[PDB]
């Protein structure tokens, strides 16, 4: 699946995650059904 | 029959959500044949342009070059201009994203062209003089005899 | 000392060498700027 | 700047000038054609903005000034030039002439030994054209008759441009440093360059 | 004696203005700076930052490779500090409260002085040309001059000017600016009124802004490993001469083409192994005035004619003033910027404001005026551009620009390959930073 | 004014408002400039091989030739090398076109065409007239740059040597326009440079006249139903004054030259009931003859 998508968009391999796509991912971690298995960000909420 | 054919419409289902954005700027090389000697030219005696930028009626060097060469902005073209013109703002308040600065509304990257560019073109480039000095040369310029 | 006494040192030039003959000099205007060694003769009092 | 508390007495003005009056105030000013004389009356109501003349006393009573009685005319500058150009121009123009006088006179003698495009002018200013600048910003806001060449004559480079037009006639480089107080030595640097 | 308030109606209703809503604050300039400094300062300050962003960021990184006294600043102005000037002469005569720093802030050199204080912090050269309309190209000339003599190894070249009230009334009085009331009478929209080389060209559109470029020693650019945008093969300013006549335009920029194979223009090219035919593009000043356009055309036509330009191998010319308008001080830099972008992308920008070519220009066969963009792809390269600008009072200038890949040919195959490695890594890190 | 409006209606006074003014005219006499840009665009974009009929058609459009256009073609051709197959075909074809350019001839026709707009019969006539080395006066109802850009596109394609095209804002519904237009068409052909720019009205005695101006039924102001009455002025009466107008110029300036007016008659009146417009209106052209 990963190969299928990023073949269509080869530029995804050479570039940065968009600065507006970073809050989106961190936002998704907060609304996720089962809590995220990792730590996405070091911040005030790091204990949580 | 033909008016009816024109009068009889129908809706073919179209489900589409489109967005606008791009990778960081790249460079396309040109094909040039060169027969040259290496050590001959003194690099200390040569002047080379490392970089450059501009502030003008069309915005920075990136947006101005797009308008000059193309005539229309790309995804990054409208995104940058809307940012420079101060149409879009960035809040760390919840919903965490790009927001319209005027009306205080959250915006994605797609609608930037639709919601802004029409107004951007008018209020960028060459237009009637907008008065930031409370004086209009063409209309009314203060005189004292 | 000749300049100080007479008020001579400032002479605003008519630019004789530019227009000296109306027809050719306007045509010679190009030819002058193009070729390197074309200059003023002194004997005619600075002619172009 | 003062706001008029009660309506000012009407004054006679031309149609062109009175229509202009309306373009600033218009809720606050009133203008009418006078049927007989075709001119207009201008009446400022309450709420108008008025600029009223006053004065100030300042600290600097002394400066180092060129000796009283100096004239560019005595040096031989034509009256047409004196009018059309800023005071700062008269300084650089005469100085250039006397600068040449140290060696040669006729500026075109340089074109004997040298191709004209190899003649350069590097001339610095901290501001330059000051008079011509203050002449526009007063004059325009004051609607006084002022020269049309003002912005050309306020360019700090235009002064030696005037000298190149009037004297040397070189076909070559023109540079015009701004060094604030240091332009002079900064100019030499680029002249050397 | 009483001074009584009145009004005036003026001819120019339109100008080329920075997009509405621009703030130096959005770019991150502190409010204290915005207050204390002229509007023109905000233009050169932000431009300098974005100019650096092309390669490096921290200005003190320059002090790693270079002793600080080898950093130079060459920054041109036609006037500069205009607001701060008009602020004093109003304010003082009006007794209004105005800033105490006025005369310091009206010095056309103080703007980049503010940038050196706030950003680079270099210990080295500062020069500030006045080229009228030609300052930008005149600035590049001296920026080039400062490097070759070892006075400074890194220079910032550029120009900037502002559009205010009394800037307009000076031009309109001088008759040099296009009269808007006449343009609307001819059915001309605001975007279409700046037309270079057009039969109907009515005089120039006044603009505002600023731009700068970073010029460096070729050896340093490789060593620092920054991007090479282009090689400056030459730069020159040129005067004209003695005459009475006011419309008569300066032709003195021809002095660069003098000597043929021995000419400065051709030798500059020849040192890269480039011929006279290899200049495809000239960036004209193209003021859209009736005086400048045909003269600059005759000028470029002749500089090609004597240098042995192959018959009918015309210089394809762009007019950026038709788009951006004419900003006096920052004129030739915007053209300088466009020319670099021309070389790397290959694309030659159109003049879209051209309805019809002036029938007078037919006599020039070495010149071609393109109304539609000619886009050069990977199979269709280009080589060298030329920036030409004519300032007021016989200020004329020429800057020969050449493609970066001409320089990479002097490194030998081993070091050439080594440089591309460094430049590639910088671009990736540069895209990151930007 | 209320009584006058009561009789004539609302749309008639508003549509009869003046349009034409002598200062908005635009003249394109340059082939030399447009032919050069036309060739280089072909040369760069060449894809299709020699079998193309477009190359023969474009060669006839490039038939505009003089010392100016030859200096262009003869150059880009001589600069062309043996690098590829396209370069071999371009060089040979260009050298042949450069040779055919040297001997090129021209014709001359002076025409005034109305109703010349896009996607129409007259537009195909206009480009063809330009293809025949003519001089053409083209009128456009809509003066907007989108209409202006079209005629520039049409000219830069179909223009030959000796060809000069003229585009103007015009309204055939206005008698003032008709009088003012032909007063412009018939005066001088002179351009006076004094302290200012004055273009004296260009005088070209019309050979062919093409009244193809065709009002369409669009009723936004409610004008519906009164249009067939008003168009009778435009299609005939105003044409009559147009014919009379150019007759005066011809008689006053004294030419024996016959202006050929092609009368756009509708096909075969009476045998169609479905057209509703064409069939009835144009039968009086027999009465006009």
Tab-separated table of C-alpha atoms in Angstrom, chain F residues 44-248:
chain	number	residue	atom	x	y	z
F	44	UNK	CA	11.181	25.870	-32.185
F	45	UNK	CA	7.907	23.941	-31.984
F	46	UNK	CA	8.422	21.885	-35.161
F	47	UNK	CA	7.177	18.322	-34.714
F	48	UNK	CA	5.191	17.148	-37.743
F	49	UNK	CA	7.228	16.101	-40.776
F	50	UNK	CA	7.412	17.475	-44.320
F	51	UNK	CA	4.185	15.694	-45.294
F	52	UNK	CA	2.190	18.358	-43.443
F	53	UNK	CA	-0.034	20.659	-45.492
F	54	UNK	CA	0.279	23.173	-42.656
F	55	UNK	CA	3.888	23.833	-43.657
F	56	UNK	CA	2.644	24.809	-47.111
F	57	UNK	CA	-0.133	26.917	-45.596
F	58	UNK	CA	2.248	28.632	-43.179
F	59	UNK	CA	4.707	29.237	-46.017
F	60	UNK	CA	1.962	31.126	-47.834
F	61	UNK	CA	1.364	33.108	-44.645
F	62	UNK	CA	5.105	33.723	-44.419
F	63	UNK	CA	4.920	34.959	-48.016
F	64	UNK	CA	5.025	38.440	-46.519
F	65	UNK	CA	8.531	39.482	-47.459
F	66	UNK	CA	10.918	42.406	-47.706
F	67	UNK	CA	14.474	43.272	-46.681
F	68	UNK	CA	13.290	43.195	-43.060
F	69	UNK	CA	11.639	39.766	-42.910
F	70	UNK	CA	14.312	38.211	-45.123
F	71	UNK	CA	17.025	39.301	-42.682
F	72	UNK	CA	15.132	37.292	-40.067
F	73	UNK	CA	14.507	34.080	-42.021
F	74	UNK	CA	17.851	33.999	-43.880
F	75	UNK	CA	19.550	34.145	-40.492
F	76	UNK	CA	17.842	31.545	-38.312
F	77	UNK	CA	18.160	29.321	-41.377
F	78	UNK	CA	21.884	29.937	-41.861
F	79	UNK	CA	22.403	29.500	-38.120
F	80	UNK	CA	20.714	26.097	-38.317
F	81	UNK	CA	23.074	23.115	-38.312
F	82	UNK	CA	23.106	19.430	-39.287
F	83	UNK	CA	22.481	18.366	-35.668
F	84	UNK	CA	19.298	16.353	-36.324
F	85	UNK	CA	16.578	15.310	-38.778
F	86	UNK	CA	14.382	18.261	-37.823
F	87	UNK	CA	17.374	20.542	-38.343
F	88	UNK	CA	17.862	19.020	-41.795
F	89	UNK	CA	14.221	19.595	-42.725
F	90	UNK	CA	14.042	23.074	-41.199
F	91	UNK	CA	17.228	24.318	-42.878
F	92	UNK	CA	16.169	23.103	-46.326
F	93	UNK	CA	12.593	24.371	-46.040
F	94	UNK	CA	13.748	27.720	-44.655
F	95	UNK	CA	16.295	28.220	-47.436
F	96	UNK	CA	13.523	27.521	-49.939
F	97	UNK	CA	11.221	29.903	-48.077
F	98	UNK	CA	13.987	32.511	-48.024
F	99	UNK	CA	14.313	32.162	-51.795
F	100	UNK	CA	10.556	32.353	-52.350
F	101	UNK	CA	10.477	35.412	-50.097
F	102	UNK	CA	12.918	37.344	-52.287
F	103	UNK	CA	10.667	37.139	-55.353
F	104	UNK	CA	7.396	37.566	-53.437
F	105	UNK	CA	4.758	39.864	-54.921
F	106	UNK	CA	1.612	41.493	-53.553
F	107	UNK	CA	-1.909	42.628	-54.402
F	108	UNK	CA	-4.006	45.439	-52.930
F	109	UNK	CA	-7.650	45.629	-51.786
F	110	UNK	CA	-9.314	48.246	-49.573
F	111	UNK	CA	-12.303	46.856	-47.663
F	112	UNK	CA	-14.643	47.804	-44.814
F	113	UNK	CA	-16.192	44.851	-42.977
F	114	UNK	CA	-18.795	44.966	-40.205
F	115	UNK	CA	-19.984	41.976	-38.176
F	116	UNK	CA	-16.493	40.494	-38.328
F	117	UNK	CA	-16.598	38.887	-34.883
F	118	UNK	CA	-15.397	35.479	-33.693
F	119	UNK	CA	-16.898	32.236	-34.982
F	120	UNK	CA	-18.675	33.889	-37.895
F	121	UNK	CA	-18.763	33.883	-41.697
F	122	UNK	CA	-17.186	37.341	-41.937
F	123	UNK	CA	-14.287	36.388	-39.657
F	124	UNK	CA	-13.451	33.675	-42.172
F	125	UNK	CA	-13.800	36.334	-44.872
F	126	UNK	CA	-11.559	38.793	-43.010
F	127	UNK	CA	-8.619	36.422	-42.566
F	128	UNK	CA	-9.038	35.406	-46.200
F	129	UNK	CA	-9.023	39.037	-47.332
F	130	UNK	CA	-5.838	39.442	-45.308
F	131	UNK	CA	-4.642	36.291	-47.064
F	132	UNK	CA	-5.224	38.086	-50.369
F	133	UNK	CA	-2.950	41.015	-49.575
F	134	UNK	CA	-5.725	43.481	-48.812
F	135	UNK	CA	-6.302	46.448	-46.510
F	136	UNK	CA	-9.206	45.768	-44.169
F	137	UNK	CA	-11.300	47.923	-41.854
F	138	UNK	CA	-12.712	45.641	-39.150
F	139	UNK	CA	-15.409	46.825	-36.750
F	140	UNK	CA	-16.215	45.258	-33.381
F	141	UNK	CA	-19.263	45.944	-31.210
F	142	UNK	CA	-17.511	44.795	-28.039
F	143	UNK	CA	-14.344	46.830	-27.469
F	144	UNK	CA	-13.147	44.618	-24.606
F	145	UNK	CA	-9.571	43.307	-24.786
F	146	UNK	CA	-10.853	39.750	-25.256
F	147	UNK	CA	-12.266	40.836	-28.615
F	148	UNK	CA	-9.190	42.973	-29.255
F	149	UNK	CA	-6.826	40.065	-28.609
F	150	UNK	CA	-8.752	37.874	-31.055
F	151	UNK	CA	-8.200	40.120	-34.079
F	152	UNK	CA	-4.513	40.303	-33.173
F	153	UNK	CA	-4.452	36.500	-33.192
F	154	UNK	CA	-6.364	36.441	-36.476
F	155	UNK	CA	-4.056	39.006	-38.084
F	156	UNK	CA	-0.718	37.520	-36.987
F	157	UNK	CA	-1.817	34.279	-38.668
F	158	UNK	CA	-3.427	35.227	-41.984
F	159	UNK	CA	-1.511	38.440	-42.811
F	160	UNK	CA	0.502	38.668	-46.038
F	161	UNK	CA	2.756	41.358	-47.484
F	162	UNK	CA	1.104	44.732	-48.189
F	163	UNK	CA	-1.548	43.750	-45.616
F	164	UNK	CA	-2.787	46.327	-43.110
F	165	UNK	CA	-5.646	45.639	-40.667
F	166	UNK	CA	-7.740	48.169	-38.730
F	167	UNK	CA	-9.870	47.380	-35.663
F	168	UNK	CA	-12.327	49.873	-34.175
F	169	UNK	CA	-15.182	50.157	-31.681
F	170	UNK	CA	-18.329	50.622	-33.765
F	171	UNK	CA	-22.113	50.621	-33.431
F	172	UNK	CA	-24.177	50.260	-36.608
F	173	UNK	CA	-27.315	51.195	-34.674
F	174	UNK	CA	-26.002	54.733	-34.197
F	175	UNK	CA	-26.292	57.197	-37.078
F	176	UNK	CA	-23.721	59.344	-35.293
F	177	UNK	CA	-21.274	56.431	-35.353
F	178	UNK	CA	-21.827	55.852	-39.076
F	179	UNK	CA	-21.259	59.522	-39.893
F	180	UNK	CA	-18.314	59.823	-37.495
F	181	UNK	CA	-16.745	56.547	-38.656
F	182	UNK	CA	-16.712	57.304	-42.378
F	183	UNK	CA	-15.667	60.882	-41.610
F	184	UNK	CA	-12.689	59.136	-40.032
F	185	UNK	CA	-12.370	56.666	-42.923
F	186	UNK	CA	-12.369	59.409	-45.560
F	187	UNK	CA	-10.257	62.346	-44.419
F	188	UNK	CA	-6.455	62.448	-44.705
F	189	UNK	CA	-4.076	59.602	-43.866
F	190	UNK	CA	-1.711	61.989	-42.151
F	191	UNK	CA	-0.060	62.146	-38.727
F	192	UNK	CA	0.869	65.561	-37.373
F	193	UNK	CA	3.566	65.796	-34.730
F	194	UNK	CA	3.437	69.159	-33.007
F	195	UNK	CA	3.980	69.736	-29.295
F	196	UNK	CA	1.377	66.947	-29.068
F	197	UNK	CA	0.209	63.849	-30.983
F	198	UNK	CA	-2.604	64.343	-33.503
F	199	UNK	CA	-3.543	61.581	-35.941
F	200	UNK	CA	-5.462	63.000	-38.884
F	201	UNK	CA	-8.212	60.647	-40.045
F	202	UNK	CA	-6.948	57.926	-42.384
F	203	UNK	CA	-8.328	58.160	-45.921
F	204	UNK	CA	-8.775	54.909	-47.848
F	205	UNK	CA	-11.389	54.692	-50.600
F	206	UNK	CA	-13.305	51.443	-49.936
F	207	UNK	CA	-13.270	48.810	-52.682
F	208	UNK	CA	-15.451	46.225	-50.953
F	209	UNK	CA	-18.081	46.877	-48.283
F	210	UNK	CA	-19.412	44.026	-46.140
F	211	UNK	CA	-22.414	44.885	-43.962
F	212	UNK	CA	-22.408	41.567	-42.078
F	213	UNK	CA	-23.332	43.293	-38.804
F	214	UNK	CA	-25.860	40.945	-37.230
F	215	UNK	CA	-27.770	41.963	-34.096
F	216	UNK	CA	-28.814	38.932	-32.060
F	217	UNK	CA	-31.887	38.519	-29.909
F	218	UNK	CA	-30.911	39.156	-26.296
F	219	UNK	CA	-33.662	40.820	-24.299
F	220	UNK	CA	-32.350	41.529	-20.777
F	221	UNK	CA	-33.827	45.052	-20.679
F	222	UNK	CA	-37.203	43.545	-21.816
F	223	UNK	CA	-36.712	44.912	-25.363
F	224	UNK	CA	-38.388	41.747	-26.737
F	225	UNK	CA	-40.805	42.139	-29.645
F	226	UNK	CA	-39.673	45.613	-30.687
F	227	UNK	CA	-36.355	44.389	-32.081
F	228	UNK	CA	-37.530	43.424	-35.574
F	229	UNK	CA	-38.742	47.020	-35.846
F	230	UNK	CA	-35.423	48.527	-34.760
F	231	UNK	CA	-33.249	46.161	-36.797
F	232	UNK	CA	-35.021	47.371	-39.934
F	233	UNK	CA	-33.152	50.614	-39.326
F	234	UNK	CA	-29.879	48.733	-38.837
F	235	UNK	CA	-30.175	46.080	-41.539
F	236	UNK	CA	-31.448	48.449	-44.235
F	237	UNK	CA	-32.031	52.118	-43.379
F	238	UNK	CA	-28.696	52.581	-41.565
F	239	UNK	CA	-27.013	50.559	-44.313
F	240	UNK	CA	-28.652	52.947	-46.768
F	241	UNK	CA	-27.129	55.843	-44.833
F	242	UNK	CA	-23.871	53.870	-44.733
F	243	UNK	CA	-23.980	53.453	-48.507
F	244	UNK	CA	-24.973	57.103	-48.851
F	245	UNK	CA	-22.178	58.123	-46.485
F	246	UNK	CA	-19.410	56.441	-48.465
F	247	UNK	CA	-21.055	57.781	-51.621
F	248	UNK	CA	-20.611	61.343	-50.366
